[PDB]
Amino acid sequence: GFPTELKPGTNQFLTTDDGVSAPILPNFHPTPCIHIPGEVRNLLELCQVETILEVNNVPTNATSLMERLRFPVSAQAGKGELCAVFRADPGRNGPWQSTLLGQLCGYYTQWSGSLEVTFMFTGSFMATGKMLIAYTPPGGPLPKDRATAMLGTHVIWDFGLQSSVTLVIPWISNTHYRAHARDGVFDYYTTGLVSIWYQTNYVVPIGAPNTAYIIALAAAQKNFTMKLCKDASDILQTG
């Protein structure tokens, strides 16, 4: 016959090798692929969808869980008071775990791209005021007050004019390698910071609730990317 020399690797079964194998049913014509609505092709499609960010990820009591979904603002907050705060950490625990984006991030090891958090004022329509939502880039420390936050990337939101406002988080990268406990994890360190202050107090006329809630939705821009699949989960199929 024809001359050969088997090279090392012969007979190995690589869980990742993606060659072809013999068909079990050679004659079988599998029922045709028809048209189904909403076909997903690449997962990054889903990363660009907005999902509620549980910023108020504090109540854990079983029937208050519907509250992590929206934080509130009220008349009782003096001008300059810190309303809320969280980091630009899609992967790591906390608020981002509720967002779909965060959830996908868990099947990947590295990633980077611009994020986008949109806020929604769902209070009475008769309410007005202003909020100062500031972003303190990675490394920068949470501004001491509303004034110092007013000197860095910020946005005065008059929920009196527009019911919605969207903020773009320029960049976040989870690529710096950490070999802490004994388990080497690829962590941020790029914990950007989003602070929210009462620029003015909550002004509402008589007859309107003195407390409104705000919902914060999040998604990743189109410049987003992920690398290295890493199947991981606390919820697996039970016996």
Partner: protein
Amino acid sequence: HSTAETTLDSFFSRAGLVGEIDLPLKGTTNPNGYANWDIDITGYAQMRRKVELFTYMRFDAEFTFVACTPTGEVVPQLLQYMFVPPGAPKPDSRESLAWQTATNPSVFVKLSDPPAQVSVPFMSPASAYQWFYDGYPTKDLEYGAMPNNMMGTFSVRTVGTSKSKYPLVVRIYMRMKHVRAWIPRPMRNQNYLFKANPNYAGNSIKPTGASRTAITTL
């Protein structure tokens, strides 16, 4: 600048272990030197929650078979792996004529011969294997039962009339190839209780993720 890693086919390939068969000599476990494994892709723990991201999928699956003794040793034993397509009848005994039906593909391989490997197609009569079904197949114990998702059965056994001389362990891996998916849906955040339904533990209802003290302390 590239985004190929996040494609469905990428996300889903890789042979994952979805099944393990024990064929001991002395045992309560598979006493007749044979076994039947209706093909379940939930065998790979991780898998259940991954696929349940969508409502409809479609794919082919390349299976690879790894067999040896418990110490992970190799032996001079022959084997018959048989595939009983859905509809065909599974062998009830170590001598059921089902072992001989030609329409039940069978591949014979010696344990020494590297892993046997075969591709199985998109069986389902429906245009897609669908993970959720909001109805009943024509309070009932048949709710959410999408039937037309059967991939078949894999009957494993030592070859020959007599019991095999050794304790054996077959492992079934499965690479999913040519994956297409539709209708995406909320990632399971609650622990799984049964293979069939989304039934969760109404007592142990947990927040999707970690919590903190105040919405002002990071």
